[PDB]
Write a protein that binds this ligand. Sequence first.
Ligand SMILES: NC(=O)c1ccc[n+]([C@@H]2O[C@H](COP(=O)([O-])OP(=O)(O)OC[C@H]3O[C@@H](n4cnc5c(N)ncnc54)[C@H](OP(=O)(O)O)[C@@H]3O)[C@@H](O)[C@H]2O)c1
Ligand SMILES: NC(=O)c1ccc[n+]([C@@H]2O[C@H](COP(=O)([O-])OP(=O)(O)OC[C@H]3O[C@@H](n4cnc5c(N)ncnc54)[C@H](OP(=O)(O)O)[C@@H]3O)[C@@H](O)[C@H]2O)c1
Ligand SMILES: C[C@@H]1CCN(Cc2ccccc2)CC1=O
Ligand SMILES: C[C@@H]1CCN(Cc2ccccc2)CC1=O
Lengths: 288, 289
Amino acid sequence: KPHVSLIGLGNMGLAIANCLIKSGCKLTVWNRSAEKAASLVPQGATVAATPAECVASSPTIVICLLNQDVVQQTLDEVIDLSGKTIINLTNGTPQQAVKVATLVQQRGAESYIHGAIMTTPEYLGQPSSVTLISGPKTAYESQKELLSSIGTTRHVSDDIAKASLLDNALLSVMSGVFEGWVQALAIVGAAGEDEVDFAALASPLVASMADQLPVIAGRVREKQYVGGSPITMGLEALENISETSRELGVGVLLGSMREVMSEAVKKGKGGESIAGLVPMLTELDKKW
Amino acid sequence: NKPHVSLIGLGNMGLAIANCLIKSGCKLTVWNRSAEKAASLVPQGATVAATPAECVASSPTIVICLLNQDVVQQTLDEVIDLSGKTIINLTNGTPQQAVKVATLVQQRGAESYIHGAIMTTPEYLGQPSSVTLISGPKTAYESQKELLSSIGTTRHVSDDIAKASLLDNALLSVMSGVFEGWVQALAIVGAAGEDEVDFAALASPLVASMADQLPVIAGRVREKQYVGGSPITMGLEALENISETSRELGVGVLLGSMREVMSEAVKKGKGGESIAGLVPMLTELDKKW
Ligand SMILES: NC(=O)c1ccc[n+]([C@@H]2O[C@H](COP(=O)([O-])OP(=O)(O)OC[C@H]3O[C@@H](n4cnc5c(N)ncnc54)[C@H](OP(=O)(O)O)[C@@H]3O)[C@@H](O)[C@H]2O)c1
Ligand SMILES: NC(=O)c1ccc[n+]([C@@H]2O[C@H](COP(=O)([O-])OP(=O)(O)OC[C@H]3O[C@@H](n4cnc5c(N)ncnc54)[C@H](OP(=O)(O)O)[C@@H]3O)[C@@H](O)[C@H]2O)c1
Ligand SMILES: C[C@@H]1CCN(Cc2ccccc2)CC1=O
Ligand SMILES: C[C@@H]1CCN(Cc2ccccc2)CC1=O
């Protein structure tokens, strides 16, 4: 059986551990809270006392910690990475991926690849569950069979930072959808409506909007901001969402969207489509 | 002969309604504050009324599509007599605004008032895939159903006049969040030198995974089930990394209300809960996040 080490046994790390044991790995684990390995012990996992001991146990090291600062802290006293391949599945920024890749290279690592898991723990290991991988193609090819334990991989780039770039863009879309969905369900529930019946009404209309995301992308690329749905009109609709909510005693999200649309109107872009908001963001480092 | 219909409002959506009503065979009379927006309708046989009152006198059915319900109310200050008139109001507004305008139209003697929420853009109006939600008296809806088929498929959601606007506001909340996240995503990948169209293709099946989990979250919200494998603490860390990814590229960042409500959920002891746990954050407190 191939020896694999895993650092991190949180919600996603434990799911990774179970996938690696099911695929036939000899697994060594480490977690700050060592008790999170308990369900792995009857399955034959070994628990390392320290990160260094965990890394010493295997030639392939998978990491899945909260963030890349925690990865750097955890690898602090891991002096010898010669012969080791690092597979980092920890969310972070593009430059954080560069920082961790450089750290492990300085300690003699053979390769670093980054992955962004685009599913939740309970679906990890299913073929529909995608993980985006970035890093040298030779390293991806060497790890692809091990990685198939967690589902389908997609090699998106040889640049080690690109999985995190794409992760952050995809999680932006997901965060916006969830912000809008939480607002919608708060309104519907406070009004005495049934959330499940509402979802049956809303899901197909969301599917339609999903099919326009590509249309918007092309217009953004081509700087085409003229259409039939101007920002002034969308902002009026958002102000009515606030008031609908307030009347029901419900709080309101979507404030950054109101603020960037309001400023677009002040700047003379009120007749533009929401594509016109993209340059509002790219031209200024500001939290709206 | 062609049935007479009047339309108040010739903006982006009002002009698209006008064209649909003309294509379906109506004798259309229109009014708009900026009267020149009727110019493309005149060669098609539309009549232009001087005033809102003259527009309403011209037909038994009056469609309204104005910016907001305050503009509808300002226009109704100019319309005293709605005897023999059915009003179809397709103006976005709040549930209470719909109740108020229904009362104003009743005081003017209207036969009926129905409210509609158009859930598409102007260029798609008239397609049978395009949905408009309708609320108000079912007899009035059934009498207007053939006329309304000019703008696509209608769905009568409730006899309660406020319901189309309640559902519109909730659906537009979802759409606004989708757009907010998509603008952020496109700004990041554009600034990074990536192609937006290729990103949309890469994103397609992943956005699909996201859109199938909306009914799952709804059921969890209804049943108050907030425990899962994707805690708010972890999601908040990912959102903080979106801000820093954006800053590394010189790009601004949206999603602030989401970061704020999630931070407060952590303060209230809900950091281990799922997204569904944010819904009671909103229903328990009138606050702008
Ligand atoms: N869960 C998901 O749905 C999901 C989906 C896709 C990707 N991911 C990504 O997977 C990564 C892990 O997420 P998760 O859901 O497993 O989060 P989690 O359940 O909160 O687990 C966090 C992990 O980080 C460790 N950790 C946190 N702070 C630490 C510190 N100061 N020192 C040492 N260890 C520390 C935790 O150790 P303890 O056990 O000792 O607390 C635990 O192993 C994140 O980057 C996340 O974005 C998660
Ligand atoms: N994608 C869309 O465009 C879309 C989708 C679904 C629903 N809707 C809804 O349709 C309604 C109309 O939207 P739209 O896109 O047509 O907006 P629009 O192009 O901005 O048109 C606004 C309309 O309201 C009129 N108006 C504004 N302020 C006025 C005032 N103070 N007094 C008199 N008239 C005034 C305008 O008259 P002037 O021409 O004289 O300015 C124009 O007729 C809104 O409630 C919107 O939410 C729009
Ligand atoms: C599809 C999964 C969902 C869990 N992850 C984080 C997350 C972020 C915000 C809200 C819930 C979960 C990202 C994913 O890729
Ligand atoms: C489906 C159409 C798309 C334009 N929407 C305008 C809008 C609303 C909120 C935020 C941005 C744009 C309204 C709609 O109903």
